[PDB]
Design an enzyme around this catalytic site. Structure first.
Site, PDB file in Angstrom:
ATOM      1  N   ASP A 133       0.840  -1.224   0.000  1.00  0.00           N
ATOM      2  CA  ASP A 133       0.000   0.000   0.000  1.00  0.00           C
ATOM      3  C   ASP A 133       0.871   1.270   0.000  1.00  0.00           C
ATOM      4  OD1 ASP A 133      -2.325   1.614  -0.002  1.00  0.00           O
ATOM      5  OD2 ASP A 133      -2.939   1.148   2.064  1.00  0.00           O
ATOM      6  N   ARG A 137      -0.253   9.054   1.364  1.00  0.00           N
ATOM      7  CA  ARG A 137      -1.027   8.995   2.614  1.00  0.00           C
ATOM      8  C   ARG A 137      -0.362   8.026   3.650  1.00  0.00           C
ATOM      9  NH1 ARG A 137      -3.777   6.244  -1.258  1.00  0.00           N
ATOM     10  NH2 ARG A 137      -3.577   3.976  -1.047  1.00  0.00           N
ATOM     11  N   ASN A 138       0.510   7.068   3.177  1.00  0.00           N
ATOM     12  CA  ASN A 138       1.212   6.106   4.065  1.00  0.00           C
ATOM     13  C   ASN A 138       2.636   6.479   4.342  1.00  0.00           C
ATOM     14  OD1 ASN A 138      -1.048   4.713   4.575  1.00  0.00           O
ATOM     15  ND2 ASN A 138      -0.806   3.382   2.823  1.00  0.00           N
ATOM     16  N   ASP A 151       3.190   1.509   7.379  1.00  0.00           N
ATOM     17  CA  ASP A 151       2.227   0.590   6.711  1.00  0.00           C
ATOM     18  C   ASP A 151       0.762   1.035   6.914  1.00  0.00           C
ATOM     19  OD1 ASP A 151       4.541  -1.612   6.239  1.00  0.00           O
ATOM     20  OD2 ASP A 151       4.434  -1.101   8.383  1.00  0.00           O
TER      21      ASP A 151
END
Ligand SMILES: Cc1nc(Nc2ncc(C(=O)Nc3c(C)cccc3Cl)s2)cc(N2CCN(CCO)CC2)n1
Length: 274
Positions: A133, A137-138, A151
């Site tokens: 992912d 945004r991570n 994560d």
């Protein structure tokens, strides 16, 4: 490791599926840390996922990956402790900046941001660790534009939800992940291509933002069919053609043709300057 009574809870930073993060102070003058604890509604399934994430995180030791500083996992309540990254996630941070004309950010700083993500991913690849992912945004932002990949679990619109299926960030996903649920270092490269597009866009727009989830899924079918009807993210205004071509190599149909993280890192640290 680690006396829980040294922790002073200050603000709730966020919340995910089996945990809740808080800003804390440590006495050990003012040391700040981020602390993840079970949610108040936690079940035994949440406690199991939290213990696993501790195990997964304990192995990751790199300047551009979030680091586990400590744990309360012995006597209860369970906790995970990391560096407190004072600037929040990279999507919110880049959203608050504009590209320097001639709070601002320079083009060489955008490259430095992307290079740090690429070095973090380079380290994950040596461990044969698949992120699944990767997205702005991570990513977390510290002091002096330091980037750490998390994560990390808000950005509801970035995930495609079907009942009884895994929740999928389809707009960051290589055509083979969408069609076959196969996630590899090669699919992390494709997501890195999308993450670099987000950085150069300054997170001003969702990837394929004018296309529906179904159109994004049918576009994966178009990469499969390979009849020249597949569509790509457009060149960001801040992005030169040479850097755009690098993003396009990340989106090669053949997984083995996508550059490794070592090459992406070299390009963004060195070639991109010329
Ligand atoms: C969501 C958020 N996080 C921040 N810093 C963090 N550092 C580390 C974090 C984290 O989650 N650690 C972690 C743990 C503990 C366990 C497993 C895995 C992980 Cl990765 S979260 C800062 C922040 N703010 C900064 C200031 N902004 C001003 C805007 O105007 C507001 C928002 N917001």
């Amino acid at each position: 490791d680690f006396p829980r009574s040294r922790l002073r809870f200050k603000e709730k930073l966020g919340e995910g599926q089996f945990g809740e993060v808080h800003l804390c102070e440590v006495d050990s003058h003012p040391l700040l840390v981020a602390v993840k604890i079970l949610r108040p509604d936690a079940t035994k399934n949440a406690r199991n996922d939290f213990l696993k994430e501790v195990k997964i995180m304990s192995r990751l030791k790199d300047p551009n990956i979030i680091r586990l500083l400590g744990v309360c996992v012995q006597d209860d309540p369970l906790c995970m402790i990391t560096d407190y990254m004072e600037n929040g996630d990279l999507n919110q941070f880049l959203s608050a900046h504009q590209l320097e004309d001639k709070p601002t950010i320079s083009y060489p700083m955008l490259l430095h941001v992307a290079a740090q993500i690429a070095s973090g991913m380079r380290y994950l690849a040596t461990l044969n660790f698949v992120h699944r992912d990767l997205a702005t945004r991570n990513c977390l932002v510290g002091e002096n534009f330091t980037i750490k990949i998390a994560d990390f679990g808000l950005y509801a619109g970035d995930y495609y939800r079907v009942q009884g299926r895994a929740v999928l960030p389809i707009r960051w996903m290589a055509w083979e992940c969408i069609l076959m649920g196969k996630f590899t270092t090669a699919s992390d490269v494709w997501a890195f291509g999308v993450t670099l597009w987000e950085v150069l866009m300054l997170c001003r727009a969702q990837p394929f933002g004018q296309l529906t989830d179904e159109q994004v899924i049918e576009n994966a079918g178009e990469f499969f069919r390979d009849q020249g009807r597949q569509v790509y993210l457009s060149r960001p205004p801040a992005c030169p053609q040479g850097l755009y071509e690098l993003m396009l190599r990340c989106w090669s149909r053949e997984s083995e043709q996508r550059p490794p993280f070592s090459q992406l890192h070299r390009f963004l640290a060195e070639d991109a300057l010329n």
